[PDB]
Copies of this chain bind each other. A is one copy, B any other.
Amino acid sequence: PNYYLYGTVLTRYGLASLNHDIRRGNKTILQKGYWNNGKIHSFVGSSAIRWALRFYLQKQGYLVNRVWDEEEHINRLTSEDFDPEKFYDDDIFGFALLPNQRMGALGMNMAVSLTPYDGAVKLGAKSGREKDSTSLHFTEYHATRYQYYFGIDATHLKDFSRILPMIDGIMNLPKVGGSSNIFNYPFCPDSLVFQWTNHFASYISYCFEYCDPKSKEAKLSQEFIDEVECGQIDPSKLWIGGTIVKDLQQLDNFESSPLNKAHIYRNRNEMIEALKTVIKRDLGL
């Protein structure tokens, strides 16, 4: 049976400057655009997240084709001919040469800041004297928690067991973005909403929303709760965990609500273990 793992991931609160626009001049423009309710939100590209996942796969010793040098800062291909059977990265993310193409089992959307981007430019002077091009400079940063949506087609994997390393990498995601020297932003999830179902329909994309346009507090959107309560989104297939668990449990009439029947774990590791057990049972691993 065609099994799909859909999930929306919310990151922790912090000062973030991960993806920048075209770099020229004084300001390093944060990658930003319009979002809900017509306000400018800072974005993190999905290509960066895919690169981070591939880097995690590399660092854990899994066999991959593309290897990050970490010294020359270039990408090396172990085999010129892509082989999804052998290499994890080719199987998961696909490839295109220009069989020389593969759609890949992982589909991920761009990361969106929960909070709109208002201000917060940084001063980038370099010591004193010799005011060259490395002199007075501006860097844009955003104090928010990013949120992204991904979807895995488990049956599309050449090796069905490779989904578990993908979940582990989503859990322990390495450095995403570039300004890690001055803006160290961990991208590990602090709130998760996973759905392990056998339908192409997903209703959990970008389920989180803010309570105050300038606060770190996060809350599941009323649309998602209404979707769960109406009858859509089978609670048995819904996996919710993280710091959103406390807010969900403090809600009134939570016990009578259908959301109570979903797999809700405050500890993310417990949720991941239970979900991996279910996935291994369903995929015959």
Nearest residue (CB) in B for A153 is B175
List B contacts of A75 (CB < 8 A): 127-128
A12 with B143: CB separation less than 8 A: no
Interface SS of chain A: loop
Nearest residue (CB) in B for A112 is B15
Complex Cα gap A107–B12 (Å): 17
A162 in contact (CB, < 8 A): no
Interface range for A: 35 or more
Given A182-B108, A243-B223, is A119 in contact with B203 using a C-beta cutoff of 8 Å? Answer: no
List B contacts of A128 (CB < 8 A): 73-75
A3 in contact (CB, < 8 A): no
B243 with A184: CB separation less than 8 A: no
Interface residues of A in 161-217 (CB under 8 A from B): 171-175, 180-186, 188, 190, 199-203, 205-206, 212-216
B184 with A150: CB separation less than 8 A: yes
List B contacts of A37 (CB < 8 A): 212, 214-216
A59 with B2: CB separation less than 8 A: yes
A151 with B184: CB separation less than 8 A: yes
B183 with A110: CB separation less than 8 A: yes
Interface residues of A in 242-283 (CB under 8 A from B): 243, 246, 266-270
A203 with B181: CB separation less than 8 A: no
Q: List 8 A-B contacts (CB under 8 A).
A: A19-B123, A45-B124, A73-B99, A110-B182, A149-B184, A172-B200, A188-B203, A227-B243
